[model samples]
Target: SQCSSTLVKHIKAPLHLVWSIVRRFDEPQKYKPFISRCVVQGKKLEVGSVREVDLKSGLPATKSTEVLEILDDNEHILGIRIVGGDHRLKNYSSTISLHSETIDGKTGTLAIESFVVDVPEGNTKEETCFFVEALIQCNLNSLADVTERLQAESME
Candidate 1:
């Protein structure tokens, strides 16, 4: 069955700063805590670019490969899918979008992550969503932390 999850975080940093972090197809480890390493398989930062990601899931790390399906810099949107991996997940795809917003006259960003996956056997859809949401939440929090810190430093 098809299952999905969506998360949104309000970042105190400008839209460009947030987009700059998430738009990099080969650098997810820079902001995602679960990703210990990322090796781009080919030319970097474009559609069809593949990344071999070393994930910190258990005592022993595991590897998964993902392809960059869409990278719309102008619209601040990115899409990727897991192509090769030993994980239980299958047919996994995700999209992230960054939007500019103003709250109390301060410019900020709205970051949204949406994912679609095929639920594996012996796992309920809720369980699958929980697992994926936890990871996404951590990544978004890291994104906010990095972006806000950079924004603060730039003000000084």
Candidate 2:
């Protein structure tokens, strides 16, 4: 069943860095390089922590996200964090977790899933375009830079 697709702009970075950044989206950008305190609400992180993400288009936009659930470390799931989106456009979810644990410690990455609601009338071209563009600019290209920076820093 093909409802339609959307284009989005995304940037890919290193998995661990991406995960760290996402978790600390509410904090100021200056503190992202170091470990910072995460703002939490009740049992979860929060219900309305908005992040104004700069896209490759050069237009600074905002994407409000809420901590949907926190996955505890388990044998099968490992370190996983699930988040929900607050938008009328689409209902998306993102997960961040460790790829594997080495002798030193755990190595991690960020995984995001962006999907819009399917209406009775079907999906529109604009929605599909937005989704695709966002994915490429935010999820893929952005993370590549993160990985590169992490590798370079490690060498020093």
Candidate 3:
């Protein structure tokens, strides 16, 4: 818990549309381009579910084992914990919250993700944050893009 941070992403899509994309804990590849395949152990869509995510090449990480700690669809909140990974992060847990808002006279969604991790040896907190934050920002950027695209498709 030495390093902590939060990131906010604004999406032009409405709350319901954006939340639908994020609530799919079983399938991040729908938005996260870095993910190639993701599979849940069994009995999908519940708290404490475990997922094995296979990362695409060109990155330091190859695989990640995560636990779904929180998924409140009614409240539009989700959380995850990385118990095993081919990376330096230790005790890493993240929470994501979606809220309703208005942007340019249209309903929008505000996505916020926060995380806590221990600073690994040979690495400073800033370095660790820089790496993780960059990846997250990339993923969130795609999330908004994908969600907005779907929002348009559904309207057509």
Q: Best TM-score goes to which candidate?
A: 3
Candidate 1, superposed: residue stretches over 4 Å from native: 57-61
lDDT per residue for candidate 3 within 82-137, as digits (tens), equals 99989778899999999999988999999999988898999888998987899789
Q: Tell me the lDDT of candidate 1.
A: 0.90
* Ranking of models by lDDT: 3, 1, 2
C-alpha displacement of 148 in model 1, angstroms? 0.5
Give each model's clash number.
Answer: 0, 32, 0
- Candidate 2, residues 1-156, lDDT tens digits: the string is 222333332323344554554444444232222222334444343334333322222223333334334443331121222243233334334333433323224443434333333332355666555554454345444444665476567765
Off by more than 4 A, model 3: none
lDDT for 46 (candidate 3)? 88
**23-125 per-residue lDDT for model 1 (tens digits):** 8888898799878888886578878898999887683439888999999989999999998877777999999999999978999999999999999999999
* Model 2 poorest ten-residue lDDT run: 75-84
For candidate 3, the per-residue lDDT at 47 reads 94
TM-score to true structure, per model: 0.94, 0.42, 0.95
